[PDB]
Amino acid sequence: MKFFLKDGETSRALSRSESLLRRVKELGTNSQQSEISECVDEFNELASFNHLLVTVEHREWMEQRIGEMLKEIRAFLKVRVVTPMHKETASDTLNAFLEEYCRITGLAREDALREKMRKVKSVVLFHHSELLKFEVTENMFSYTELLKLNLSLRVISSQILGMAI
Amino acid sequence: MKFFLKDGETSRALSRSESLLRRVKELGTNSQQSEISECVDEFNELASFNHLLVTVEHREWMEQRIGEMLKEIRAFLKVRVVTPMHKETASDTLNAFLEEYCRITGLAREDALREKMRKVKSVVLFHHSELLKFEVTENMFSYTELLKLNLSLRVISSQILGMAI
Amino acid sequence: MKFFLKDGETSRALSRSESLLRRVKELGTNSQQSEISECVDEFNELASFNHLLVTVEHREWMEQRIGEMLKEIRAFLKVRVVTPMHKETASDTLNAFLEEYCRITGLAREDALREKMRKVKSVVLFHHSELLKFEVTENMFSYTELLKLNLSLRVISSQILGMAI
Amino acid sequence: MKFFLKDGETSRALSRSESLLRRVKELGTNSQQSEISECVDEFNELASFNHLLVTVEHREWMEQRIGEMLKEIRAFLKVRVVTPMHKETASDTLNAFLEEYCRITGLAREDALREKMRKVKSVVLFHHSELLKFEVTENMFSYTELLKLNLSLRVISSQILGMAI
Amino acid sequence: MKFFLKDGETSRALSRSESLLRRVKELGTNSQQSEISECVDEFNELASFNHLLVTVEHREWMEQRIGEMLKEIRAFLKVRVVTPMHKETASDTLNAFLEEYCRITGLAREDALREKMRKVKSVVLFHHSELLKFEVTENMFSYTELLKLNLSLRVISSQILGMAI
Amino acid sequence: MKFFLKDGETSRALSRSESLLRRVKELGTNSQQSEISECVDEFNELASFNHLLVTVEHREWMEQRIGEMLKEIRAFLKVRVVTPMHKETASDTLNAFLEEYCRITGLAREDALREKMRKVKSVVLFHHSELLKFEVTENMFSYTELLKLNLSLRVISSQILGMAI
Amino acid sequence: MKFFLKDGETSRALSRSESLLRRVKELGTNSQQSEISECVDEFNELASFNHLLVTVEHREWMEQRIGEMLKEIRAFLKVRVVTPMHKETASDTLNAFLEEYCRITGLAREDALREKMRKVKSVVLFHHSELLKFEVTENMFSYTELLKLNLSLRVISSQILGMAI
Amino acid sequence: MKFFLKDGETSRALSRSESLLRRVKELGTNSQQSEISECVDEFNELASFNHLLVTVEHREWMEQRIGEMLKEIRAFLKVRVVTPMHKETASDTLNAFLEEYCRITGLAREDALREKMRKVKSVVLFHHSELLKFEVTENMFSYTELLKLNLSLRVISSQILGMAI
């Protein structure tokens, strides 16, 4: 149950993340997905290590700042991670989520259209998070509030934003 | 405090409402507001009388069906009462309600825009209800669920249905 | 269920009742039943309207004085309304109520005589109230305390006021 | 404090009261006051003796039926004792009690008239009881219920039985 | 239940007892039992009457001194009432009470001898009280404390005052 | 606080008391006070030792019959120990106690006569017990019950057994 | 039950113990067990007597310092009383207690070894106390705390002081 | 806050730990500290990873065996990890812990000697645990029970195992 971290390590990871931050600030709309995606990899490891570090420290206290930087790296990187449900309209955003949920769950549309946005979004988001190795939350889209609504997609689409089907 | 109803009266009002119902079933998308609106007047009176009749009976019990019909007339007439916030888009529906609330409350837009849809709607609706002498509820609009959202109009407009201002 | 009152209306009724009051203060022991009785009619309508008004206001509050005059008009008019149990003696007052109760309830005398004055009175009173469209209470008679006694008419008539049968 | 009764005594009194009972059953509406009144005398003595007897026995128990007959004799004799408030009408019965209370208490009429019948009666009754050496209760009158009313004589006289003053 | 006393009576009995007191002060060791005993009769009657008078007054209060004298007469007369258990020795006093209790209860001696003095005395005393129509208490004897002892007569006799049997 | 007994001891004292018992049975009314009194001495020591033995055993239990013989020796010896208040009458028994209490306490008679027998007896008995090295209880006298009475000697003497002073 | 002490006695015992104290102060590490042991004998007797003296006094109070010296003698003598479990090592101290407990209880070693030191110690100590007629407590050994441990002898010997068996 | 693990990973770590177990079973009392210590390094990393794996899984469940092996590796490796307080005697074990605690805390001996073994032990153990990156518990020493004693080191050393200072 109990584990300790190799000593050349907190600092190895502190300056390893320091220069991730440096590197992430460099990104803009045309660094390749090839770049960005390994930029995530790095972030992800450091995120892990931090969780170790935290619990170690917490455990060590009982025997009686990196994350601050990660917090920032996230904020920069958040902006360059794009899913296929990143759309130009409220309306296509919804379809994206619909079709994507159908894709993931393997459900017919008729059934997915009955599902509340809330499931559909968190089903779809967890999926892509897993897949990008980056947590992708609702406030990473401009239609955040839309994606939080507790109503079936059909109702949202017809009663909230006058769509067909 | 106590009052009695004139006796040639319940039936006078039963068959008076019977032929209202008859008449209301006749309405369609082109009877004039001039027609419809007196069709409401009548309904309104019968609604009043019924409240008397009810309270009289209730009082009489303690000394020890028309409404069913009204319920129907309502359902029919509900469909022919149009407000100026009856719109073809989700988007204009929202503007209508905004502009109308500004009009009623005399608030600037900037402030109205900060208000939750919910207030804005029931403020506006009560207003027009009073004005048409007919109760006008959210489910008298195709954008019912929209009108129920507990979010500022600004948020709805930008995050729920990508509008400008 | 919900109804609204026509707007030229509260005031139409306020000054309608104001001059009822004027008119009722003119009555005295020799205005005809013909006069008085229409005087009640008017009072009755205004009493109804008030009940609408009250409930409208109460309802309107939730979306967030006439009766005072009625109260007076009642007080004045109370004094000029006569039932057939208005009698010159305590004794005939009791008979009047007995006979009338028998009439209303269809009971034999023998049974009515066993009834407590209290029922008998409020049975009879409610009846005539209904009938005159005016509430007729016990203190509209000079034998009020008598009409309040919780004793069978037999007992009242023999033990309280030495009558035969 | 302690006293004993003379031994030829309980039985002397048992058969003394036995023949009182015999004698009292003979009375009817025309035995003279002269007769009846001695009939009370006898009853009174036997009532006393009984109270001694009772307390002696009770006392004697601690060192470890006549009254039944008296109870009857009372019942018979109760019916033949007359006060000056024994009247033919409810109405004079009330006056009788009024006037008598004024006499006993020395109050003005105006004040007595404000008193509740109940006091007035039990004031008057106790008085005459004392005076006739016989307990005189309300059900010794035909207007018993009347004498029990908890209402001022004024109210009773005007509202209950339409009298003047 | 309720009885009244004849009016020429309290005073008739006040001065009737006043001259009893007078007469009782006259007694000394040689007035005959014939004198003394009627002196008790009188006392006894006055004692009775007083109990009436008391209860009458007490009852009369609720409708809102002789005894003092008796108290004295008692004290004087107490001293002249002799029982057959009035003895010159502690020892014979005990026998007297034994033999007398055997007489009254009809018990054999052997059993009486086992009884506690206390019973034996209050049995015997009540008896003679009843018989003399005067209350005869322990402190009417010089051996009061003896008569109060809660010990069998056998024990008293042998262990308290070295008697035989 | 804690002590142990020398081992050649329980038995040394068991047969030492066995032959005391033998010796005490020999006593009769004419063994000298010189004999008897050393017979007490012995008994007293054995009594002591027993108290040790008892408490030792009791203590020893917690770390987890002689007296029966003493009980008998007492019973025999009790009968040969005589105080100066051993008298032939109830009456002289009392004086004995009186004079003896005066002697011990140094009080005047007038004061001692006021004292309750109970004090006077236990004052006097403790004294002689101390003095004879033998506990002398009330039931060692034929007037036991007398000596237990809770009354002043004066009262006992005059009211219980007709003495002078 | 009650016993008295012979009067030439408290002082006989006070100076008897006074010169015991003198004598005990003389002891050192080479007075023979022969000396010391009779020194205990004496102490023991005086301890006894004291218990008598105490209870006599306590008893005598109810009829309304030697021990201080014994307290001291104990403290001196305590230091010269040796058991066979008085050892040079923690290790042999344990064995001594083990073997001794086996001897006393007649248990096999295997079972004794499982017993908690606490029992074993207070079993063994009470035994030798009884046998030396001196209370022998844990703080009469240099390994007090060891003797107090609530652990089986096996555990103590192996885990607390690296012994074999 | 949320992180994901790289997918070629759980199995990379499962067989990585599988062959650690193989290797650890090889150790015996003569594999160098150089060997053993890197054996711990490995174990430590796998312990870390596991904590990640666990939390990921636990987190993933909410969106709705390696450790078993580590448990074993620990048990084997536990036996080959030695501290400087691993001694041949109870006695030196104590010193070792004392001196070590002085070293860690920088306290004088005099004060350390007053500290309860319990603190001293868990202070010293946490230290070396941290320093070996292996949890080192009391039952990794043959004097477990000793190390658990709630007594100052001075008392333990003098009263429990007859040491000097």
C13 touches chain B (CB under 8 A): no
Helices C10-24 and C66-77 cross at an angle (nearest 10°) of: 30
G46 near G66, Cβ under 8 Å? yes
Query: Which tokens sit at B9?
Result: 């009266």
Q: In Å, what is the CA distance from D43 to each residue of B82, D34, E1, G41?
A: 98, 15, 11, 100
| Cα end-to-end span (Å), chain F | 53
Cα–Cα distance between C82 and C87 in angstroms, integer?
A: 10
Q: In whole angstroms, give the CA distance from residue D106 to residue C143.
A: 30
**For residues H86 and H93, what is the distance between their CA atoms, to the nearest angstrom?**
6
Token readout for D1 is: 């404090």
User: Would you list the DSSP string of A43-88?
Assistant: HHHHHHHHHHHHHHHHHHHT---HHHHHHHHHHHHTTT---TT--S
For residue G95, the chain H residues in CB contact (below 8 A) are none
Residues E148, E151, E156, E159, CA torsion sign: negative
Cβ-Cβ contacts under 8 Å for C53 (sequence gap 6 or more): C5, C10, C13, C66
Find, among F125, F118, F16, F113, the residue nearest to F81 by Cα.
F125
Tokens standing for residue D20:
């009182």
D131: contact with C, CB 8 A cutoff: no
Q: Which helix or strand (DSSP H or E) is residue D74 part of?
A: helix D66-77
Q: How many contacts (CB atoms, under 8 Å) link E and F?
A: 46
CA B128 distance to own-chain centroid:
8
B152 in helix, strand or coil?
A: strand
Preferred mutation among F139, F148, F161 to probe E, highest tally of E CBs within 10 A: F161
Instruction: For chain G, say whether H48 makes contact (Cβ under 8 Å).
Output: no
The Cα-based distances of E54 to C141, D4, D54, G45 in angstroms read: 52, 16, 15, 80
Beta carbons of C159 and D146 less than 8 Å apart: yes
Q: Are B161 and A161 a contacting pair at CB < 8 A?
A: yes
Q: How far apart are CA C146 and CA C154, in angstroms?
A: 13
Q: Measured between CB atoms, does G89 come within 8 Å of chain H?
A: yes
Q: Do C44 and B3 touch (CB under 8 A)?
A: yes
Backbone angles phi, psi at A152, to 5 degrees: -65, 155
Residues 6+ apart with CB under 8 A from F110: none
Whether H140 and chain G come into contact, CB under 8 Å, resolves to: no
- Helices then strands (H, E): number in chain H? 8, 0
Both tokens of F153, joined, read 């000697």
Contact: E2, D52; criterion CB under 8 Å = no
> Can you tell me the distance from the alpha carbon of H110 to that of H88, in angstroms, rounded to the nearest whole number?
24
Contact list in B for residue C126 (CB cut-off 8 A) is: 63
Cα distance between residue A49 and residue A42, in whole Å:
11
The residue type found at G91 is S
What residues are paired with D116 via a beta bridge?
Answer: D152
DSSP classification of residue E152:
B
Helix (H, G, I), strand (E, B) or coil at F129: helix
Q: Which positions in chain G touch F4 (Cβ < 8 Å)?
A: 44, 47, 129-130, 133-134
Rg (CA), chain D: 20
Q: Does C touch D (3+ CB pairs < 8 Å)?
A: yes
* Domains defined for chain H, CATH in brackets: 9-82 (1.20.58.1200), 83-165 (1.10.1200.170)
Nearest to B136, CA basis, from B125, B146, B148, B147 = B125
**Which chain D residues have a beta carbon less than 8 Å from that of C116?**
none
Q: How far apart are CA A18 and CA A13, in angstroms?
A: 8
Asked if D162's CB is within 8 angstroms of C142's CB, the reply is yes
Contacts of B142 in chain A (CB under 8 A): 158-159, 162
Q: CA C16: distance to chain centroid?
A: 22
Sign of the four-CA dihedral D36, D42, D45, D50: negative
Q: For residue B17, which amino acid is it?
A: S
Q: Do F4 and G44 touch (CB under 8 A)?
A: yes
Residue of F nearest to G62 (CA): F126
- Residue D127 tokens, joined: 């008085």
Of G97, G92, G137, G91, nearest in space to G113 by CA: G97
Is C33 touching B (CB cutoff 8 A)? no
The sign of the torsion formed by the CA atoms of H76, H82, H85, H87 equals: positive
| CB neighbour list of residue D32: distance below 8 Å, 6 or more residues apart | none
Could you say which DSSP state residue A4 is in? -
- The reply to whether F47 touches chain G by the CB within 8 Å rule is yes
| H16-24 CB contacts, 8 Å cutoff, 24+ apart | H16/H42, H16/H46, H17/H46, H17/H66, H17/H69, H17/H70, H17/H73, H18/H69, H20/H46, H20/H73, H21/H69, H21/H72, H21/H73, H21/H76, H24/H73, H24/H76, H24/H77
Taking the CB of residue E137, how many other CB atoms lie within 10 A of it? 14
Give the number of other CB atoms < 10 A from CB of residue H154. Answer: 16
- State whether A160 and B143 contact (CB < 8 Å): yes
Taking only Cα atoms into account, the Rg of chain F, rounded to an integer number of angstroms, comes to 20
Half-sphere exposure of residue A87: CA atoms within 13 angstroms, side-chain side: 19
Q: Would an 8 Å CB–CB cutoff place F51 in contact with chain G?
A: yes
Coil, strand or helix: which one is D32? coil
For chain B, the first-to-last Cα distance in angstroms comes to 53
Task: Give the DSSP per-residue string, C42-59.
Answer: HHHHHHHHHHHHHHHHHH
Structure tokens at B94: 């929202």
Cα–Cα distance for residue pair A143/A96, rounded to 1 Å: 12
Chains touching C (at least 3 CB pairs under 8 A) are B, D
- H160 contacts G145 by C-beta, under 8 angstroms: yes
Compare CB distances from E145 to F89, F143, F160 and report the shortest one's residue.
F160
Q: Do residues E117 and E150 lie in contact, with contact meaning Cβ atoms separated by under 8 Å? A: yes
Measuring CA to CA, how many Å separate E102 from each of E107, E121, H78? 5, 12, 103
H or E stretch including E60?
helix E33-61
**Angle ∠(D152,D157,D162) on CA atoms, nearest 5:** 150
Mapping DSSP onto H, E and C, the string for A104-138 reads HHCCCHHHHCCCEHHHHHHHHHHHHHHHHCCCCCH
Nearest CA to C95 among C84, C81, C82, C79?
A: C84
Q: Nearest CA to H4 among H64, H60, H86, H72?
A: H60
Contact E139, E78 (CB under 8 A): no
| CA of A63 vs chain H CAs: smallest distance (Å) | 7
Q: Rounded to 5 degrees, what angle do the CA atoms H140, H143, H148 make?
A: 90
Query: With contact defined as beta carbons under 8 Å apart, do H101 and H114 qualify?
Result: no
Hey, is the C-beta of A161 within 8 angstroms of any chain B C-beta? yes
> H69: distance to nearest CA of chain G, Å?
30
Nearest CB neighbour to B3, from listed C1, C2, C48: C48
Closest CA to H42 of H18, H10, H9: H18
Nearest to E162 among F89, F155, F158 (CB): F89
**Rounded to whole angstroms, how far apart are CA atoms G152 and G163?**
13
Residue D29 three-state SS: coil
Pairwise CA distance, residues G151 & G129, whole Å: 23
Tell how far CA B22 is from the center of its chain: 21
> C159 vs D151: CB contact, 8 Å cut-off?
no
Candidates F145, F158, F162; nearest CB to E160: F145
Both tokens of H161, joined, read 């195992």
Say yes or no: F137 contacts chain G, CB-CB below 8 A.
no
Check CB contact under 8 Å for G162 and H143.
yes
Q: What was the elucidation method?
A: X-ray
Q: C126, G49, D81: which is closest to B60 by C-alpha?
A: C126
A139 touching B, CB under 8 A? no
DSSP label at residue C115: S
- Enter the resolution in angstroms: 3.3
Give the 3-state secondary structure of chain G: CCCCCCCCCHHHHHHHHHHHHHHHCCCCCCCCHHHHHHHHHHHHHHHHHHHHHHHHHHHHHCCCCHHHHHHHHHHHHCCCCCCCCCCCCHHHHHHHHHHHHHHHHCCCHHHHHHCEHHHHHHHHHHHHHHHHCCCCCHHHCCCHHHHHCCCEHHHHHHHHCCCCC
Touch G-F: 3+ C-beta pairs under 8 A:
yes
Residues E76/E24, Cβ–Cβ less than 8 Å: yes
Contact F146 E159 (CB under 8 A): yes
Q: A123, A101 in Cβ contact below 8 A? A: yes
Whether A132 contacts chain B with CB within 8 A: no
**CB-closest option in B5, B44, B122 to C4:** B44
Residue B116 three-state SS: strand
Residue of A nearest to H67 (CA): A1
Please state, in angstroms and rounded to a whole number, the distance separating the CA atoms of residues B127 and C64.
Answer: 12
Which positions in chain A touch B156 (Cβ < 8 Å)? 145
Q: How far apart are CA A48 and CA H54, in angstroms?
A: 12
Whether the CB of E141 is below 8 Å from some CB of chain F: the reply is no
Rounded to whole angstroms, how far apart are CA atoms G3 and F49? 10
The CA distance from B20 to B29, in Å, is: 18
And the tokens for F61? 């239990």
* CA–CA separation, H26 and E47 (whole Å): 121
User: DSSP string of D88-148?
Assistant: SSHHHHHHHHHHHHHHHH---HHHHTTSBHHHHHHHHHHHHHHHHTS---GGGSTTHHHHH
Inter-residue contact F134 to F160 (CB < 8 Å): no
Q: Indicate the residue of H4, H63, H130 with minimum beta-carbon distance to A44.
A: H4
Provide the number of CB pairs (under 8 Å) joining chain A to chain H.
52
Reduce the DSSP state of residue F87 to 3 states and report it. Answer: coil
Backbone angles phi, psi at F32, to 5 degrees: -70, 155
**Using CA atoms, how far apart are residues H100 and G67, in angstroms rounded to an integer?**
50
Q: What are the C-alpha distances in Å from F96 to residues D139, F88, F92, F150, F165?
A: 79, 11, 6, 17, 13
Euclidean distance between CA atoms H125 and A9, whole angstroms:
23
A141 touches B at CB < 8 Å: no
How many other C-beta atoms are found inside a 10 Å radius of the C-beta of residue A29? Answer: 7
Closest CA to F47 of F13, F79, F19: F13
Residues 6 or more apart whose CB falls under 8 angstroms from that of G48 comprise: F3, F5, F52
Amino acid at A23: R
Task: Verify whether the Cβ–Cβ distance G130 to F47 is below 8 Å.
Answer: no
Shortest CA gap E158–chain D (Å): 29
Distance from C-alpha of E122 to C-alpha of B98, rounded to nearest angstrom: 107
Nearest to H130 among A4, A45, A135 (CB): A4
F163 contact partners, CB below 8 Å, separation of at least 6: F91, F94, F157
**C87 to each of C27, C37, C91, C95, H10, how far by Cα in Å?**
21, 20, 8, 10, 106
Q: How far is C99 from chain B (nearest CA, A)?
A: 20
C72 part of contact set with chain B, CB < 8 Å: no
Q: Where are the beta strands (DSSP E) in chain E?
A: none
Which of A90, A145, A159 is nearest residue B143 as measured by Cβ atoms?
Answer: A159
| Dist CA H118 CA H150 (whole Å) | 6
Six token digits for residue B64: 């020890």
Q: Does F104 touch chain G (CB under 8 A)?
A: no
Q: Give the C-alpha separation, H111 to H97, whole Å.
A: 14
Q: Which of H88, H158, H161 sits opposite G161 (nearest CB)?
A: H161
Residue A62 to chain H, least CA–CA distance (Å):
11
For residue C153, give the H/E element and its range.
helix C153-155
Task: Tell me the C-alpha distance between G85 and H160, whole Å.
Answer: 15
| C95 interfaces chain D, CB cutoff of 8 Å | no
